[PDB]
């Protein structure tokens, strides 16, 4: 992200590659020129000009050393995104344990983290990361697991961005929805009052999908996944009492491809 989003260590990487190459090549060239000087103890003017270029470049690169604290500051500025990604990868790896068919590989996460920007800067890139990982991983989870993952992404965002009272409100609303904690939630807009009225009126899925649509605003069906895809291999799964061939028939009819 520091070589691609801000290009920070992009130009710092080309600069440090040039600096290390300068170190090695100029040490070798200084050894060769000192050997020539020992052999010599037109040519004099060239040697003096090369020496002057060498000391000017070395002086400039030594004065460039003071930018390294700025580089380290800019590197450690983007670390909250790292902790968030560690949380996201841990949640991917642990949803590989509730079921035997929801595994995760590191390469897929690397691919999606490149594709988030292949196509409040920290807040914007964090929002992009959450949105893209949800978009790319909603298609491998069924309705229950997809809804759970969406709720976890929304709660993680609203707890690592917003304050503590909203966090406590979300926790107690979840606890009331789980029929575990018998405590009236504290509201901070009309949406929370509407949710309280709905759970008073024994309506759940309406307000749950209301919160889900409040978090994410873009949907991704199987056609969208197969359209914006890189690999040529796709695996489809379902449950036994549900077929899925007719959807592929409709997709092939729409996309004008010979399905066999």
């Amino acid at each position: 992200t520091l070589t691609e989003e801000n290009a920070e260590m992009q130009r710092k990487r080309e600069d440090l590659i040039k600096l290390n190459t300068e170190y090695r090549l100029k040490l070798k060239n200084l050894e060769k020129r000192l050997l020539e000087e020992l052999n010599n103890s037109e040519l004099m003017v060239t040697l003096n000009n090369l020496k002057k270029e060498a000391m000017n470049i070395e002086k400039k690169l030594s004065e460039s050393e003071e930018f390294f604290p700025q580089f380290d500051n800019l590197v450690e500025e983007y670390s909250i995104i790292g902790k968030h990604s560690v949380k996201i990868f841990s949640m991917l790896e642990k949803f590989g344990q509730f079921h035997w068919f929801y595994g995760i590989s590191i390469g897929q996460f690397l691919s999606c983290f490149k594709r988030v920007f292949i196509k409040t800067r920290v807040d914007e890139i964090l929002w992009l990361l959450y949105q893209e990982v949800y978009c790319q991983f909603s298609t491998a989870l069924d309705k229950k697991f997809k809804m759970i993952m969406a709720m976890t992404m929304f709660c993680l965002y609203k707890f690592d961005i917003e304050s503590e009272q909203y966090k406590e409100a979300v926790l107690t609303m979840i606890g009331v929805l789980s029929e575990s904690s018998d405590g009236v939630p504290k509201l901070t807009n009309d949406d929370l009052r509407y949710l309280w009225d709905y759970v008073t009126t024994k309506s759940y899925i309406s307000a749950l999908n209301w919160f889900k649509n409040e978090f994410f605003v873009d949907e991704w069906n199987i056609a969208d996944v197969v359209a914006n895809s890189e690999n040529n291999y796709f695996t489809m799964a379902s449950e036994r009492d549900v077929d899925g061939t007719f959807k592929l028939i409709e997709l092939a009819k729409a996309s004008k491809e010979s399905l066999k």
Partner: peptide, 24 residues
């Protein structure tokens, strides 16, 4: 024209101490 070479040799003999310290 030898002043630059003399200064380079002097600088090498100067930072020899830091070379020893950041060698050990």
């Amino acid at each position: 024209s030898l002043t630059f070479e003399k200064e380079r040799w002097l600088n090498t003999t100067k930072q020899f101490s830091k070379t020893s310290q950041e060698l050990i």
